[PDB]
Amino acid sequence: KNIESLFDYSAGQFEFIDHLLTMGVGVHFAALIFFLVVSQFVAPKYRIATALSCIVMVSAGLILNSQAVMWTDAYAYVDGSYQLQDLTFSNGYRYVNWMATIPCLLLQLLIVLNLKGKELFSTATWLILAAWGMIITGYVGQLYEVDDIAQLMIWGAVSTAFFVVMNWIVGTKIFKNRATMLGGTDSTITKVFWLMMFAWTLYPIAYLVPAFMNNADGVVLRQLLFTIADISSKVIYGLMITYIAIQQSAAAGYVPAQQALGRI
């Protein structure tokens, strides 16, 4: 059902995708240790934001590791190329994982924006429903990326409408609550918004590769785009969130955060 199953791969293509996925595992688990160790410098009111980064690192790291092993299970070197065997490889497992990781990425943003109480709960609910609508309609669309490109496009348009509305909610909350943020992080948080807009827009570009580059090099490109996007949207983003959490912690008087920042 997916374009990966259509092609034999050169050794260079096959090895490069394997190395991409494996490097992605290493980066996420390396970053996990960082977020774990610095969580003791985050004030209680923000510490869940850094815990969420830990959860996202393991969740994303496990899906990338599962994809890497599925890639090597599915293909074997036969008659000079990597050819599909009895098991298949597909990107559908990424979509299922996004059902958990996208809410985690959004929730840590809302925590450092200082939303609390009812506004936090209600903003998180609408965001998570919009994200789940995006993910589910995209998952259906990519079931047709070989059989029915028209259908891929239409479900992709519906998914993109949820994406746009979600981003509208996020941006409205950022620009509305910028003013509450401590330690100069009202300037930082706007950069986080732009980082999200850039990095999350790479996923719909990967989703469209079947329409514009249906060949083995398009398969490689899609995994390359996922890799750039994953590291940007989860690791670099989490580092910025953690920086904002620690900076606001210090400005609110949390002594471990003041001492951590002073040490650098």
Ligand X SMILES: *C/C=C(C)/C=C/C=C(C)/C=C/C1=C(C)CCCC1(C)C
Ligand Y SMILES: CCCCCCCC/C=C\CCCCCCCC(=O)O
C-beta closer to ligand Y: residue 23 or 48: 23
Name which position in 53, 101, 123, 159 contacts Cl ion (CB under 5 A): 101
Burial zone of 207 (CB within 10 Å; 0-12 exposed, 13-18 middle, 19+ buried): buried
C-beta closer to Cl ion: residue 106 or 216: 106
Give the range of 5-13, 52-60, 135-143, 239-247 binding Cl ion by CB under 5 A.
52-60
**Alpha-helix residue ranges (DSSP H) falling in the chain:** 11-38, 47-74, 92-112, 117-142, 149-177, 185-212, 216-230, 237-251, 255-262
C-beta closer to ligand X: residue 161 or 252: 161
Residue 13 binds which one of ligand X, ligand Y, Cl ion, none, with CB within 5 to 8 A depending on kind?
Answer: ligand Y
Interaction between residue 235 and Cl ion (CB under 5 A): no
- The alpha carbon torsion through 15, 18, 19, 22 (nearest 10 deg) reads -160
Whole-number CA gyration radius for the chain: 20
| 75/38 Cα distance (integer angstroms) | 40
| 9/15 Cα distance (integer angstroms) | 9
Joined together, the tokens standing for residue 77 give 């070197």
Nearest residue to the partner ligand Y, using Cβ: 26
C-beta closer to ligand X: residue 142 or 185: 142
Residues that bind ligand Y (CB under 6 A): 12-13, 16, 22-23, 25-27, 30-31, 33-34, 36-37, 40, 133, 151, 154-155, 158, 188, 227-228, 231-232, 235-236, 239-240, 243
Name which position in 13, 53, 97, 137 contacts Cl ion (CB under 5 A): 97
Residue 171 binds which one of Cl ion, ligand Y, ligand X, none, with CB within 5 to 8 A depending on kind?
Answer: none
Per-residue burial over 132-148, b if 16 or more Cβ lie within 10 Å, else e, is bbbbbbbbbbbbbbbee
C-beta closer to ligand X: residue 75 or 222: 222
Residues that bind Cl ion (CB under 5 A): 43-45, 60, 97, 101
